[PDB]
UniProtKB/Swiss-Prot annotation, chain A:
Ca(2+) 2 binds at D54, D56, N58, E65. CDD domains: EFh. Ca(2+) 3 binds at D91, N93, D95, E102. GO terms for cellular component: myosin II complex. The keyword Plastid does not apply. The keyword Metal-binding applies. This is Calmodulin. The lineage of its organism: Eukaryota, Fungi, Dikarya, Ascomycota, Saccharomycotina. Belongs to the calmodulin family. Ca(2+) 1 binds at D18, D20, S22, S24, E29.
Swiss-Prot record, chain B:
This is Spindle pole body component 110. The chain holds residues 898 to 936 of 944 of the full protein. Residues 3-30 are annotated as: Calmodulin-binding. Homodimer. Component of the SPC110 complex containing at least CMD1, SPC29 and SCP110. Interacts with SPC97 and SPC98. Belongs to the SPC110 family. Present with 279 molecules/cell in log phase SD medium.
Amino acid sequence: NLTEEQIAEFKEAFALFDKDNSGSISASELATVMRSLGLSPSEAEVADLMNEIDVDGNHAIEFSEFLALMSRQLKCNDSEQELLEAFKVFDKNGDGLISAAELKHVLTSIGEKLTDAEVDEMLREVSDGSGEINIKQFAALLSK
Amino acid sequence: RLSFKTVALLVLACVRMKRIAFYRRSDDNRLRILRDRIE
Ligand SMILES: [Sr+2]
Ligand SMILES: [Sr+2]
């Protein structure tokens, strides 16, 4: 599934968690990196992650388990690029937001004649009080 | 040397773990309330 280069690249990332170069990621290494990035995992969350990811049962994430953790991201790279391209179809001015005027232009392109009021309402249903739709909301919308 | 890609992959891995933990904890809580409700 993975090339020699893909393995190498993940190994470098893995090595950044592994502060003492022991060949695995401890609960303290995991908690430290996550906290330094502002993710504030609780102890119960860290304990759960070690249990779920290190199926070897040593409370130390090995490289093979790190790869299995990240493999879905590789499987999903094409979908992520498509999502961004689809968002760009709406977002003509490229400011990372979809407005009602941009939604209207797509609607017209595909032969859907809606009043401006209906376009406003269409956008409002999925915007969160906002006048525009951002990439997060675009993705959330497609999560059913 | 150290590349942007390497840093980005560390960040992605951390974000994925945070999300997994959040949703596992949230699933465990909801299964517990339903366990009680079932008696
Ligand atoms: Sr270590
Ligand atoms: Sr825009």
